[PDB]
Structures are given as C-alpha cells and as structure tokens.
Symmetry: D2
Subunit: 262 residues, 4 copies
C-alpha cells in the first residue's frame, strides 16, 4: 500500500502532536489502503540561525511521540543527528529518518541500521540520484532490511531547489522511493536567517511525483501554518490533507499501470 508520512515539522508541544495525530488517525480510518506514518522532529539541529527554535530535547520528544503512538495506534518516524541517538529513538520510531545534509555520514547510517528499525534517508541536495546506490549499500551492510530514499530537491543556483523527477525511477532500482512534497519547494536560507517556501507548488509537484511513480509521499502539516516554529513557509493546513490524499490515490490508480518495471 502507498505510504503517507505526515505530521508537524517540529515537536512544538505534545498538544500540537495530539491535535495533528487526531486528524492523521481520522485519515487512516478513511483511507484504509494507505499506510500512514506520523512524523515530527524532536530537534531541528541544522537551523540557519542560532536564534531559531530547535526543540524540547530528545527525551521529551520520544515521550510526545510515544503518546501519539499509543493514543492513536499510528506508526512513528523522526530524524536523528548523531550516532548515539539511534538507540533511544528506535524505542519509539518505526522508521528512523536520516537528514539530507547527513546522508553520507557512515556512522549515523550504520547506527540507525543497527537498531533493526526501518531507515529512510533524505537525498542530499548535493547528491546525484545514481550516487544513492552506495548509501543503500552502507545500510544493507549495517543490517537494515526496510530501506527508503526520499527525494527532497537538488541545489539549483543559490537559495533554490529543483526537483529532477528522473531521480524517482533511478533510485527505485535500489530502494523504495519517498517524495518529500514540502521540502522540495523550500527555498534554502531565503528569508535572511531562515529558509523560505512556495506552498502554491506543493500540490502540483505531488501530482507529478505519483504520476511518475514513487512508493510514498512525505508532507508536513500544521493547524496554523504561518505560526509553525519551523518551516512556516511550507506546512500544509490540516484541512487540506484529505483532498490531496484523495487526488494522490486517484492519480496513482490510473497511472500505476504505466509505471516502468524494474
């Protein structure tokens, strides 16, 4: 079944996680043919500015995520930034996410693989799609069995990203492919001491992704997007999720017959 990874970008509070988890649960009940994974970062370790919001700590985060998992029965995913975080995070995370800037850090990859959990690596903005085969090679060597590669855009000049959709079938040769719909339209460090984003392109590019063919979509959401303490320019209003999920499934159903084999 198609994978939908969604949640608020950062764990601003567990009240937030619960409110968003409530909607994700409703969506999981409505879309039985979709595997929903709740995502939220316990820490924003790569913010452009030392003044920006980071989070409330790994432990608080794991606790908030566990609360969502137990209250709504949803699978969880969160990212790690240094090797020691793999083990404590694997306690609650079904899927351990590896940040794009850190996609080549061997030890971080081996540490995630060692937990036995699934691993999803965001493709670096500096990495060519063919260069991802080696990334999968490290994770396999380390013992990983469920492996994902996420498309989140490529460096195109300064403060801008372009999505080379050719990367979807190329990467599918070595792993399941996830399309990060929110960060692919993000304009890196575009707002001075923060990054920007163009929400108007989120939906059309998602349509493109499922038309080309991928195994899932990653999309951040928030009850009040403009108020998000991280990635404000990109979060999708909670109410828009249902409509976009519906479109995804409908487009996939008519295009899947044309997806290239192997």
């Amino acid at each position: 079944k198609f994978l939908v990874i969604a949640g608020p970008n950062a764990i601003e509070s567990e009240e937030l996680l619960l409110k968003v988890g409530e909607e994700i649960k409703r969506l999981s009940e409505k879309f039985k043919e979709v595997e929903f994974v709740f995502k939220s970062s316990f820490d924003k370790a790569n913010r452009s500015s030392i003044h920006s919001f980071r989070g409330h700590g790994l432990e608080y985060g794991v606790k908030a995520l566990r609360k969502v998992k137990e209250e709504f029965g949803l699978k969880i995913t969160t990212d790690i930034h240094e090797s020691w975080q793999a083990e404590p995070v694997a306690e609650v995370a079904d899927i351990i996410q590896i940040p794009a800037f850190l996609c080549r850090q061997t030890d971080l990859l081996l540490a995630a693989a060692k937990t036995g959990r699934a691993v999803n690596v965001k493709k670096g903005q500096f990495l060519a799609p063919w260069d991802t085969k080696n990334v999968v090679e490290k994770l396999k060597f380390g013992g990983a069995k469920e492996i994902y590669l996420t498309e989140r855009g490529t460096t195109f000049g300064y403060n801008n990203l372009v999505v080379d959709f050719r990367s979807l079938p190329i990467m599918k040769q070595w792993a399941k492919v996830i399309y990060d719909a929110t960060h692919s339209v993000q304009l890196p460090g575009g707002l001075g001491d923060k990054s920007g984003g163009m929400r108007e392109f989120i939906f059309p590019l998602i349509r493109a992704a499922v038309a080309v063919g991928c195994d899932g979509v990653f999309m951040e959401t928030h009850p009040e997007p403009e108020k998000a303490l991280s990635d404000a320019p990109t979060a999708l209003p909670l109410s828009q999720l249902e409509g976009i999920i519906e479109a995804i499934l409908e487009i996939r159903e008519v295009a899947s017959k044309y997806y290239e084999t192997i």
Copy 2:
C-alpha cells in the same frame, strides 16, 4: 481540447513526413478530443558540428509540408531562424515555432507575430519561468493572438538539462503551455560532436507534465529513431505514439479535477 504537436525532427525526406503524417492522421481520427499538429523543421540552423545534417532548404521544406497538409488535412508547424523566414513559412505553417536560443530575439518574434499566425516560443535553457512574461508581451505588441510557451528543460550543469515543473503553472499565467517531452531529456553536446539523450525518461516525465497541468505536449517521432539524422537519441518510436497519447488522456482526465486556477 488537448494539443498534441508531433512529427519527425527534421525534413529528411518526403517519404518520412508522409509515413509519419499518415500515422498522425490515423491517430487524429481515433482521438477526436485531441487537436493534432504536424511538426518538422526544414533546417537545423544550430547543430553543434558543421558536419551535421541541416536540411534540404526552406523551399523544399515549405513544399514538403504543404504535401502532408493537403494530403492528410493536418495543421502544420515549423521553426524559423531569421526574420525573413517569417512571411514565406507562414504560407503553410499554422503555428510558427521560435527556437529556444532565439526566444529573446525581438525581431524574430515580432516578424512571426505580424504574419497573423499562431506563435509558439520554446523557453530558452537560460530563461527563468517568470521571464516568459516579457516574451508574451512582445508577441502581443506585434499583434499575435494565439501564443504558446514550450517547456524544454533548463541548463543544469554541463551537458545536462532538468525540468523544473514549477514552470508549467508559472508560465500558464500569461500563455498556453506546451511540454516538450523529447528535448527535455536531451543532453546538450553530450557526445561532443552531437547532442545526446535518455529515452528512458521521456514517458515518465510526460506523465508528470499532464498530472501537473499543461495545454498540450510536443513529441518528436520517427519510424526508426536509431537512423534519425538528428536528435536520434530523443526521437520516440513511431509505433509507441498511440500508447503514449492514450496514457496522457487517461491521466489528464483524472488529474484535471485538481489543476489549480490561474
């Protein structure tokens, strides 16, 4: 009414245009909800090598096209390279095509617009999406009424092009958008003396194109791509043209329920 512009890249010979034109004709009969337009250049005025096939002259070109037109009742389109070719080409071409490298040449556009025919400007590999606004403004000034903007990729490093699908909804603000499925996967000077390409990506990107939303697609075809006198690595096998058309109509029927409003 979806627009499909197809045909052999260059006017290699009468037999070529006729063999393709009849296949195009047959398709125009089966897919009545589509508006077909026959394409073919009478001269490749910008090859890499001085030893590469260019054409059999403008006279032999306008003549060969008139044959396909009067024999199959198909609309016609071909590209002009210098101001003077505007009037003489317009005698057969319903749509005058402006080369990618020339999208900024004021007079060429001005001349094509005066002929009263439809103008289709290919976006330059060096042009940003929002910069097409000035291109449309010129053509209107010159009296053009039916204006098209064609997406054919953007310079991404050396000998490579990427398709920034954000350009479709951006250029649609001031003109109808066509997606060039063949040149968008072309590798500029990829072979030193001649350009290269990756046919394996033509179809997947066409699918993204229509899922995103465009008014039509541009496809170059040939009975045996391998033997094409130019763009051989990008030409689509004439026998695959039907399956592709049917695929996009199916995808378009479903995706159109979601195209944003401009």
Copy 3:
C-alpha cells in the same frame, strides 16, 4: 600583445562614442603595450522588454563607429544579429562579434567569416567550455583566420551567472580567449523586465582572469553609468578604466610566468 575591448554598450549617440573614444585613445597612447579596440552595439536585438532602448539603427550605427575610427584611429568591433549585417558591418568593424544567445547559429557564423574580418564569439550561457571547439571549427570552415572566444558567465540557477574559470585554460586550446568583465557579473532578468548586476565584483574577477591567463579583457564603460540606456548597472565609470588597466598589466606581468603552456 594584450587585448582590451572597451567602449559604450550601445551607440546612444556618436557624441557619446567620440567622448569615450577620446579617453580610450588617450589610454591607447599611454599603454603602447596594450591593443585597444572600440566596442559598441548599434542595436540591442535581445532586450527583455519591448519597451527598452535598442539603438538608432545599423545605418546611424556603422556611421558613428567610422567617425570614431577615422578621428581616433582605433580599431572597431560591434555585434551582428542576422546574416545580412555581416558584409555591411564588416566595412567599419575590425572584429565581428557574435552574441551569446546566437553562438550556435551556423549561418550567422559563416556570414561573419566570409567578410574576412576577425570574429569574436560570446560563449553561450548554456554552453560547456569543451563545446566551443565546434564553434571555432565552423569559423575555420567559413574562412576565419583570427578567432576569439569570450567568457561571459554560465547559467547558475535562475537570474544568475557564475564564471567557471576552468574555461579559460580549456578554450585556449583552440582560440584566443577574452574575458567579459562586465556581463560576467550581470543578473539576467534580475530587474523584472530589465537585467541587473553588481559592479562590485567586476574588478576582482578581472584580476582572477588575468591571473589564470587570458588574451584580453572585454569591459564596457560610460561617463555616467547610472544614466546609461543599456546594461547601466554593469557599466564602469570612465575615470576608472586607467587604474584597472594598470592593475591588469602588473598582474599579467607577474603571473604570465606561470600560465600553463598549450
């Protein structure tokens, strides 16, 4: 000896040409080691906006250029846009310049080559260094003996150019290399319907160019750049030309010892 092509971007008035032509003449006598050449276009054939200055016609153009050539004795150079402007323009211009966007237009090259003059091709923003080889091959085929290739930046994302200095030592393998100091720092379409730029980086990159090794510098100047009718943001005040020219000679003096031998 070292080549320095300077002058107003556009022939705004022979008054301007002569005024600048005055200062150039002066520097031409002070730097007997340098080979000066007056440059100016009679028509900006590729402006972004239909409402932007273009010039006063090829007639008034070739006219003013002669007035400067006969009164100051300086060589002249100007750019052609269509094949029919070669023969006529080749009357006053010592070196025929081929615009960047038109660097692959075969007939335009062959046209400038037949006139017997020297041809200076602006390297396309979409062209790789090694691909200029064929550009020269066309000129040699057309009868050109004195061929130049001018580095003027490469497409780096949208509305931005980057100078890949590796190009100097690569293109030098088959033609004399000139570095365009003014347009290498321009921002294409940076002002909406007008191009922008930042003159703050012109001198620094000039030093880089001579340090790396090139045969000449191309830099447009103007009495009051702020009032220029074209490429205003990239015009060097007239009073700074002397200093920059002195700097170039000193750096070339010390660095030439290391230029890689071809």
Copy 4:
C-alpha cells in the same frame, strides 16, 4: 601573514605524516612570511563507499599529529565529525575544521568553539556565500574568537563543482577566508564508488584566488598522489608545493594593493 594549510588528506600512517611534515617544516623555514598549518584527517567519515579507507582511529590520529607538532614545531588542524570529538582533538589541534556537509550542524559548531581553539568551517556545497553569516554568528555565540570560512566549491549539476569567486569578497565581511585549492576541483561521486578530480586546474584557480584576495590557501599533498588512500585524483605531488607557494606570494605582492576594503 598569509596562511598555507597543507598536509596529506588522511592520516595513512604516522610515517607518512613525518615525511610530509619534514617538507612542510622546510617550507616554513624558506618562507618565513607565511604561516604554515599542517593538516590531516584522522577519519574520512563521509566516504561514498562502505568499502573505502576511513582511518586508524581518533587516538592514533591525535598521537600522529602531536608527533608532527613536537618534532617540527608546526601548528596543527584536523576535522571533526561528531560533537564528542572536539575536546580530545583540541588537545593537539590549533584549528578545528568543520566538514562541508556538516557546516550547519549547530552542536558540532558549538562543540568546536567551546574548546577555545580556532575554527575553520568548510562552506557546504549547498550554501550561498551570504548564508555563511549565520555560520559565523553561531561560532561567536559558542565562544570562538578566531574564525575561518573555506571556499571549496559549489554544486554545479551532478558530480561537478564550480568556484564562484564572488564568494571571497562576500565572506570576508564576516571572517577570514581560505580557498581550498584541492577540493574545489574535486568531482563528487565522479568515479562511481569514489570521487575524481581535475588536478590540471588546481594551480590556475589558486592564482585566481590570490588575485581576487583571500587570507590563505588550503592544499593537500602526498609523496605519491596516485597511491593516496583518499582524494588521490586531487593530491599535489609533494615536490610541487614550493613552486606554487612562491607563485602565490609573487601574485599576492602585486595584487594586494588592489584588494578592496570590506
């Protein structure tokens, strides 16, 4: 006092370090106007392949570097990859280097600044020159007093980097600037499961850098480049360093007066 940071890329053995160190020591004696810093990584933590050489461990590396410092009295610099490494490395390192892919990891920058040692951040291949201001701001927040920013190229298409020399003047506004002559000509993932490089452009671009104006140069060397355990296609022959350093000082002497005031 121009900074020349040089040494073998990785600590292949304590023996290789003393061999290169003996030479760095010789150069520090011949060029007393230059400040030399010996560099070598105790771990290549971001190799493309799980099969490539990484190193002999932090303990062994710190011991190897301390032997060089003690025996030759040279300053030492090496890079770190996780926060816990800062302190032990600070025991020997005069300058703590931050890898390019990790230039935005807040905790690693803070760990390095907290040691009280100088910090040199390699500018990420995805970072715009102006984005480095926040980098410096994080370092000052962490307590760093001596800060460096190193230019090592920018992502240009796939498997290729380009040096935007406009970054030198830009970054100089916030910190001292170093030009990495070795990695700026590196070709990311170019060799499949390894990276390639164009050594032929190393010297040319170093000349450019000093011509433009920087505070120092970074150059990796090796007695037998072909046999280096990492970045082999970019290591300079140990015997060629002297000639290059001499050229640097010569070009810097003349160019220095033209350096614009920040």
